[PDB]
Amino acid sequence: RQQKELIVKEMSEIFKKTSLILFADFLGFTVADLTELRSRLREKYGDGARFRVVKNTLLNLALKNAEYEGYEEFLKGPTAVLYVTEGDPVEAVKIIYNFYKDKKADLSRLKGGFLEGKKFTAEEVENIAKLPSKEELYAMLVGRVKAPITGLVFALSGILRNLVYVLNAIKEKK
Amino acid sequence: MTIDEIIEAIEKLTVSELAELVKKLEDKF
Amino acid sequence: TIDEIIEAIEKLTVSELAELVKKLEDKFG
Amino acid sequence: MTIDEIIEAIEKLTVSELAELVKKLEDKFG
Amino acid sequence: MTIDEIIEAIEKLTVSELAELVKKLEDKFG
Amino acid sequence: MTIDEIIEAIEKLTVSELAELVKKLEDKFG
Amino acid sequence: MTIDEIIEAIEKLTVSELAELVKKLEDKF
Missing domain, CATH: 3.30.70.1730 (Ribosomal protein L10, N-terminal RNA-binding domain)
Structure with missing residues (x-):
């Protein structure tokens, strides 16, 4: 043909x-x-x-x-x-x-x-x-690479967040 | 105010008072 | 006071704050 | 400063100093 | 390797390789 | 650079350098 | 000691070192 x-x-x-x-x-x-x-x-x-x-x-x-x-x-x-x-x-x-x-x-x-x-x-x-799509993979990569820095910030601000958290828990109890 | 004294003052706070404390802590930092 | 409680918390060290939180957590659960 | 020395330095900060440290870190390390 | 060279290597990765890099980085940094 | 190599290079970066890498990775991709 | 001196010291850690520091902070606080 x-x-x-x-x-x-x-x-x-x-x-x-x-x-x-x-x-x-x-x-x-x-x-x-x-x-x-x-x-x-x-x-x-x-x-x-x-x-x-x-x-x-x-x-x-x-x-x-x-x-x-x-x-x-x-x-x-x-x-x-x-x-x-x-x-x-x-x-x-x-x-x-x-x-x-x-x-x-x-x-x-x-x-x-x-x-x-x-x-x-x-x-x-x-x-x-x-x-995940390739675009999402790139977003994920950026987060993985940044994780140590993000983990550092959250670990530190978490000390104060735990204070607010337990306080609201006490209020919640009442 | 030591840590225990701070705790005592908080234990005496009312529901609304606690809301104010949390509100002010969030702002302070 | 409430403003007083906050000023006291501002003066605590990080270690003293962690202790404060642990103790508050301990009074329930 | 070693890792453990950094932690010991952080433990001795006041709560208001901690709040600022967190604010500052978010900027410098975005 | 410098920052620019790390990036150049990354831009060369296929979707499959990118997935492996993401998964491996995941296990390492927590 | 193989993948294990890319990860090895990243672990050697200082924190300042890591932050720049992230900033760049965002620009080149998103 | 100072916030600035602490930030400055963190900037000089390697990524591997920062990962360990984070792990310690998490486990500690």
Whole structure:
């Protein structure tokens, strides 16, 4: 059909800049289901993330050309692909995760993929869905680094706060 | 006023009086 | 007084304050 | 000043000095 | 390593690595 | 710098230096 | 001794040292 080369070249260049690639078994899901998942994804990513159905053969060639390795396992049988080209990469995983849950689907259907290059398995999907966004991770990092200073201030002002605390407790008793 | 004396004066404070004490402590620092 | 209690608390050292708090905590619980 | 010396120095501060120390630290170390 | 070099190393971390750094810092400073 | 290295470097900072690191981390990220 | 002398001394501790100091303050007060 040769239009394949168009998609393989198209797909290949996409996989070179993705921050997320996740393989999902969407077999059995309906047309309405597809539209719905894509709608949830756009609500957060605009054009930045996609959920597409592509023949394993072409998908395999695109991944291959992208220089990825050990993905063959995720391609056993018709497989759809979820990927992010712009924005937080973790949110897309949380979206499809709770979507499968909303659909009472076997979460093992989320086979695995690559998170910013790092391969992850079906089991780790749940761990990724529990990760805070990258933006929140940065906020958390700032707090972790600052903890000694914050701990110092609170430890010191706590001596006076404990006074106010017990005093209100005495008042409370009456 | 030693620590015990301070405690005695506080034990004698009324509900509203305690509210004032706390209020003033918060402000003082 | 109340203003007096506060002035006394202002003069206590940090150690004397920790003691004061512990004692207050002790009279209940 | 060692860590333990810092603590001993803090213990000897008055309550009003403690309140100011806390206020100051919040600024210098934001 | 200087402050600027610590920051440069941090900006290079992937989301996965960032999560590890956050978790490790968590255990260390309490 | 590996992650363990980043953490090792941070532990060596003085408190003044730590405060500057935090201030910068906020600016570069948030 | 002085608030300023205490702050000055804390500024010179390393992060590891400050973490220990905090732990001690917490356990003490």
